[PDB]
């Protein structure tokens, strides 16, 4: 099969005719018809993972496949596999732990202390087939096609998550930063459709405001015009909002929005854009709020999030197919920032 | 009566002699028996309460009698209180709320957008009287006299509150910085009595080490001569703490111990103190740490603490009683270090 | 004013003419414009409430205006109320505490040792004015108007925290029995506002079907015609559904949907309908489901349904207005089940 | 090896002489150490667990090998097994999920839809060698032997999900019935060690009150002399408990304790013994209890458990060892109530 695979740090991805696994056991093997990319693959194809080295840190074993956004029909399975047959359509949770740890026990495999991250340090959806370690790592596709639910496997756990960790309920209001964005407008969904929260959206271009209040934002905000802090004071009456869900934070976003924090309101950082958290202690201390980190999300998360888009109760991102020989051209899109909506490969 | 007040900000606390309250309605009158002094009085008495003013923030109207930590005989009340009786020994919350506000509604009543702090922007227990605005904010003392439950009012709900925000249980590890002293000592034991965790004190001096230990810590290190977090990694085999409760912080522990975090640890900061957090948000999104202010606390952590004191469960701090005349003595005595245990007034 | 009010068991309720309470404190008086009748009502002029005795057990001093559902313009304030000006349109939430006692310091006001319930064992609102103990206990409308809001009161905030005991997140499916009445309808729109999750609701008449579907239903069955829990194992993969809502149960609901339930599954029970849950332990043990009750709810809850409400998130239900004279006949209609929606009286 | 078996529904268990399994992949081999024996036991050899049919809805394929309670050293492990070494000490959880299900992806193994129950439908610890599906459900032992170990697979765990059940914190009160018997002074120890609320203990006999209390109950009740829900009612200042953790229940408790129930109670059931509970909705509905079923436990507990029992803050139970030859004499004893302690097998 051909497969684009990550050969030697820096230089740019290689595409290589390798041999097909044979799935044993609880193995499953997909035939690849959707490879997301996002922003993720091209710190990826640097060597690192949010300032790490899948070489030195994550003990990786190169050349390995990127791809951690995977969606497909059933090649074939191992003998161990129960409740799947060869021809489904599925969508894959690439976070995968060992089950000995305790983050594993406790039910948090994605915090794994010797993570399985199909793309990342195993190999991933960038080829014609993947392997999947465990046929539990998957969910049936219905409703959806391999395109619209390969996204959902990092995108879409990962802001189904950080609304969990924003703590709403029909008693508070939320903030999304760049709510705009294809990261943002999920995010607006999700809360919408699960917390009956006031939903405020905060982006800078007339066009990402638009997308916000389309996504289903009680208030949207073009911070480019009005006062970002100003608008949401009066908006909340000056309470401050409950929690703020900062997608691909920068240093701007985390020096101007813990400003609108109301009293224990819960500060969600998502992404791994390089740059500090400087504050207050005794601000901290007086109002009672949280700062929270928040990566991809566990086998409960990614249940939730399939079952809310395969229920139509989420909307699919926007996206744009490519082969799997563009590859390179898709990462450098996004390294650019002239990528469309969510980039995916069609092996 | 005479009243230790906070007649012009900067000065010393004046004595003077003014009248006896009157309680109407739900109000009851309570004869002090116990007045606790902390380090928030040394703020107090320079007009901020951590980096505030009573005066232009919280609306003080000075003179004001201080007092936050009050235990006492029920002198008289109003025609609306139910179930106290003149003679009762109880100990009072002073963190009250007006009721109306999100966080009065939500039983978070210490965060009150109007605050009745007595002690604070309310006379407090600086006097040989002092009015309780609602009697549902007391608790009959049986077990304790006045002097043990006074402290408790105040580092007893604190550290009850903190604890529970490390949000602890059997399967986890707490690191509690400054161990050995009053409110670290009390941290311990709450947590020891209420989370079935293991519990890892953490303080300088070698007399502070041994009365973590006493108080219950599994472990305790002297920072003075163990690298703090090389001995955390060993007793923790290198997972981390799983929460850090870090009572009065400072730039030092705030710049060392958020390093003993495992993932999804939670570092719980209480005090005042004047420092800044520092920390690179890409490690706190990977490994989904939280930073969680805390102060004082609600009903619900003052009957917990309460109940636990009461119940022996938990043992009164050691106090140094005082006359009330030493007001600024005792205040001094903190502001230069020099104090001995909790001391309190005896009016 | 006139007040229609309960002067002896048994006989209908009279109309009088009393005097207009003035309000002091805390204390507001509203001009009554919205007062709703429900079935809880039938009871009370039969001296119960729910196998109880306004007189015997709730210690009312007879008579007593009913009427538990209030909406109504501010007509006076006590000079402690703060926050709410004559004129101000509100809805009031009459399950209040006396605030003493380890509900009402838990945050849990309903279950209040010695409640305040208004129109319960407190002058109610079938009456042109109506004290209101406490301004906090108000919530101002801007949206809805006092016939939209006053019923909020009792079946918003009672399927408000019924939808909250069900414990619901996008990852399950909740069975609403009932789900095309008045009461059903109004937690299938709360459920699908704030849950997320899949929504089943059950009646028996067609045209009751149709409104469950309306008010936003995944799934509706008709009882009359095919298999209630044929149907629910179908949709749900024989997995069951995590929690059923059934109110105002019947011996039939009870004996019918409990088997019905997944492992873990909640069974929430609402209302006073006199009769008896039987059930096999060792089903509970090995399933791990839970019987738990539900009545009204707290400030917290209020608080939420009404936010819903104001935000259109949740819509009003059907209501017919009538004159504060047709109590009786309001009462009847609801005694017979000829009731058309909900019977509001217009002072 | 020699293993015990269940060869013939009714008949006794059947000494047989069979091969040793060779561990492949994850699963690991132990030399049996500890084999418990419970009541549980007792229903296995007649087929049933629980009102249910090990044959016909367990699929079971007799013979089976029975022991559900494992402890001993690791003989030998397939070629994926991480983290442990031939010949460490290590407990065993029994209860284990396949991980596809909805049960085992939410971190409720034990509720799989096809359960792999070590013990019950998999061969168990009645041998001298027993299989390991996963290495992830093991526990190494350092501070207790085998013996001391193999019980908590089981009573332990148990008791551990249900103080858990019980939502407890240290302003509210516990009743444990039969506080005297084995299950009833671990759950005291475990209620003791990890809640901080205040643990009232009922049983019968004087020699099971004294038990109840050296566990640590705060409060013992001989139901024998004086009257339990008087004594609760005294105890409790007629609030009644928070919660009620029934220790296989029967007929009589089930019709009892539950008027010991306060408002918001929960009534937690534990065990198989076969009764119904008959209880007036209405009730239940105002007094918003609940009752909630309760079984074995997930890997989390089982963490917990152990984390508790290593760490000495919780004590192994008396336990009485016996030859793997005397399995049906130690069922037996059971089954006539005669047993000493907790009986322990040694191949
Ligand atoms: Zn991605
Ligand atoms: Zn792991
Ligand atoms: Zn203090
Ligand atoms: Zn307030
Ligand atoms: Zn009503
Ligand atoms: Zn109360
Ligand atoms: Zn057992
Ligand atoms: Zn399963």
């Given at each position: 099969?051909?497969?684009?695979?990550?050969?030697?740090?820096?230089?740019?991805?290689?595409?290589?005719?390798?041999?097909?696994?044979?799935?044993?056991?609880?193995?499953?093997?997909?035939?690849?018809?959707?490879?997301?990319?996002?922003?993720?693959?091209?710190?990826?194809?640097?060597?690192?993972?949010?300032?790490?080295?899948?070489?030195?840190?994550?003990?990786?074993?190169?050349?390995?496949?990127?791809?951690?956004?995977?969606?497909?029909?059933?090649?074939?399975?191992?003998?161990?596999?129960?409740?799947?047959?060869?021809?489904?359509?599925?969508?894959?949770?690439?976070?995968?732990?060992?089950?000995?740890?305790?983050?594993?026990?406790?039910?948090?495999?994605?915090?794994?202390?010797?993570?399985?991250?199909?793309?990342?340090?195993?190999?991933?959806?960038?080829?014609?087939?993947?392997?999947?370690?465990?046929?539990?790592?998957?969910?049936?596709?219905?409703?959806?096609?391999?395109?619209?639910?390969?996204?959902?496997?990092?995108?879409?756990?990962?802001?189904?998550?950080?609304?969990?960790?924003?703590?709403?309920?029909?008693?508070?209001?939320?903030?999304?930063?760049?709510?705009?964005?294809?990261?943002?407008?999920?995010?607006?969904?999700?809360?919408?459709?699960?917390?009956?929260?006031?939903?405020?959206?905060?982006?800078?271009?007339?066009?990402?405001?638009?997308?916000?209040?389309?996504?289903?934002?009680?208030?949207?905000?073009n911070a480019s015009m009005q006062d970002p802090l100003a608008e949401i004071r009066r908006i909340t009456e000056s309470k401050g909002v409950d929690a703020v869900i900062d997608l691909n934070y920068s240093e701007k976003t985390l020096s101007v929005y813990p400003k609108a924090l109301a009293k224990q309101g819960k500060y969600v950082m998502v992404g791994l854009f390089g740059a500090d958290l400087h504050y207050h202690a005794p601000l901290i201390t007086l109002s009672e709020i949280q700062?929270?980190?928040?990566?991809?999300?566990?086998?409960?998360?990614?249940?939730?999030?399939?079952?809310?888009?395969?229920?139509?109760?989420?909307?699919?991102?926007?996206?744009?197919?490519?082969?799997?020989?563009?590859?390179?051209?898709?990462?450098?899109?996004?390294?650019?920032?002239?990528?469309?909506?969510?980039?995916?490969?069609?092996?």
């Amino acid at each position: 099969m051909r497969a684009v695979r990550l050969v030697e740090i820096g230089k740019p991805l290689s595409l290589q005719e390798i041999g097909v696994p044979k799935p044993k056991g609880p193995q499953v093997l997909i035939k690849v018809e959707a490879a997301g990319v996002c922003h993720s693959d091209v710190h990826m194809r640097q060597g690192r993972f949010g300032n790490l080295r899948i070489v030195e840190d994550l003990g990786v074993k190169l050349p390995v496949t990127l791809g951690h956004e995977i969606a497909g029909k059933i090649e074939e399975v191992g003998d161990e596999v129960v409740g799947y047959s060869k021809g489904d359509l599925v969508a894959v949770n690439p976070w995968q732990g060992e089950g000995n740890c305790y983050y594993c026990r406790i039910g948090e495999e994605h915090l794994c202390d010797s993570p399985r991250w199909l793309g990342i340090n195993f190999d991933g959806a960038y080829a014609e087939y993947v392997i999947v370690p465990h046929y539990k790592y998957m969910y049936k596709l219905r409703r959806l096609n391999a395109v619209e639910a390969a996204p959902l496997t990092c995108s879409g756990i990962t802001t189904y998550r950080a609304v969990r960790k924003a703590s709403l309920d029909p008693t508070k209001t939320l903030l999304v930063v760049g709510a705009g964005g294809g990261l943002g407008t999920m995010a607006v969904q999700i809360a919408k459709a699960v917390s009956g929260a006031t939903i405020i959206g905060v982006d800078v271009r007339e066009e990402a405001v638009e997308a916000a209040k389309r996504a289903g934002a009680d208030y949207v905000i073009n911070a480019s015009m009005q006062d970002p802090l100003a608008e949401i004071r009066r908006i909340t009456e000056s309470k401050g909002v409950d929690a703020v869900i900062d997608l691909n934070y920068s240093e701007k976003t985390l020096s101007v929005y813990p400003k609108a924090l109301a009293k224990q309101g819960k500060y969600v950082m998502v992404g791994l854009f390089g740059a500090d958290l400087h504050y207050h202690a005794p601000l901290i201390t007086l109002s009672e709020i949280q700062f929270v980190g928040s990566l991809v999300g566990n086998q409960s998360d990614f249940l939730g999030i399939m079952r809310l888009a395969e229920a139509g109760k989420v909307k699919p991102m926007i996206t744009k197919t490519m082969k799997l020989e563009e590859a390179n051209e898709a990462i450098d899109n996004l390294e650019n920032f002239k990528a469309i909506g969510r980039q995916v490969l069609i092996p």
